Amino acid sequence: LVHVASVEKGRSYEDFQKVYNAIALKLREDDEYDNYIGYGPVLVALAWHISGTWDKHDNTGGSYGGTYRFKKEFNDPSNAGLQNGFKFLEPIHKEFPWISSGDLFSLGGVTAVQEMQGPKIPWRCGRVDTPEDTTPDNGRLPDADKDAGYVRTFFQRLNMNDREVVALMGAHALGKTHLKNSGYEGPWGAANNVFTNEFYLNLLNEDWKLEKNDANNEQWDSKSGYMMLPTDYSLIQDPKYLSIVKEYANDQDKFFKDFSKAFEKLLENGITFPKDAPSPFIFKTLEEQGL
Numbered sequence: 001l002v003h004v005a006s007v008e009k010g011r012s013y014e015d016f017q018k019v020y021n022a023i024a025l026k027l028r029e030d031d032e033y034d035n036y037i038g039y040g041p042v043l044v045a046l047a048w049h050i051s052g053t054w055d056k057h058d059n060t061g062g063s064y065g066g067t068y069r070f071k072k073e074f075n076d077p078s079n080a081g082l083q084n085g086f087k088f089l090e091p092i093h094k095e096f097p098w099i100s101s102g103d104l105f106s107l108g109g110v111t112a113v114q115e116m117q118g119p120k121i122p123w124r125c126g127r128v129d130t131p132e133d134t135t136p137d138n139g140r141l142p143d144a145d146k147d148a149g150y151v152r153t154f155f156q157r158l159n160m161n162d163r164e165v166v167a168l169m170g171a172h173a174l175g176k177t178h179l180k181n182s183g184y185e186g187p188w189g190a191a192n193n194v195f196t197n198e199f200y201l202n203l204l205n206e207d208w209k210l211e212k213n214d215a216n217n218e219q220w221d222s223k224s225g226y227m228m229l230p231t232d233y234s235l236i237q238d239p240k241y242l243s244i245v246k247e248y249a250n251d252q253d254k255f256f257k258d259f260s261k262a263f264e265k266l267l268e269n270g271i272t273f274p275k276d277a278p279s280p281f282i283f284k285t286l287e288e289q290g291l
């Protein structure tokens, strides 16, 4: 099963920058969402879950098909809450009906990271909508109540290694858990709509206490009012993971570089880019444009 990137007919860089700008302007505008966190975090969670269904063994799932738009996938329990990012992006698809669904979903994650002051994330167009019967079954995304062995195995399905797994998990500096969505409740840090190395710092520097939440699930809670999932806490339980956690706590630029490569790879898993496709695009922020 091969998925070959196909550029939207006649579109170039400047066209996609417009779609970026529209997402970015709307991010600016809808600042009240989720108690003033804004929609940045749910947008990067949506781009991760639509890519996270990939299976490297048979190339099923992945971001290419746009299959999150079908009821079997948006009804995935693992995706509870992400209907809000989809709803956000609907006016944008309306304004730019020529972009594919996979391209829009994935571009929404890139746009969110950069406007929340994270690193630049190169992005490539050419995902093509596939039909309903290519929608992967539920159950392909990761459980939160497991340990580092589980996490390591899980991410190997996505062809991610130790550094990649730890870099990628740093996105949990953003947003928060919601009891009615996941059975977990609370934020990971204080600046949860700015992209920083705070997750790593909080992991190492906080006083964590293991507790049961109101949904009867175990989670780690700090005196500062922060939390960590069991899978998050894994990263300082495994010695290999802990080494890298310290690295990123100590050096945000290194974390930024590694996240950037890892997020692009995650969003492009399963896609074949022809030799003569366009080079990855690096979009300007609104700020960089005076907008």
Ligand code: HEM
Residues within 6 Å of the ligand: 041, 042, 044, 045, 048, 080, 081, 142, 143, 144, 145, 151, 168, 169, 171, 172, 174, 175, 176, 177, 178, 179, 181, 182, 183, 184, 229, 231
């Ligand atoms: C072992 C892997 C991980 C587990 C078990 C997992 C689990 C969770 C859980 C349960 C939530 C809260 C959902 C809610 O209640 O609304 C959460 C949210 C979040 N996750 Fe993860 N996650 C994983 C990895 C990742 C990765 C790789 C990324 C992206 C690069 C990511 C991005 C985020 C973000 C940004 C949110 C916050 C969204 C918002 O506030 O609504 N997660 N995750």
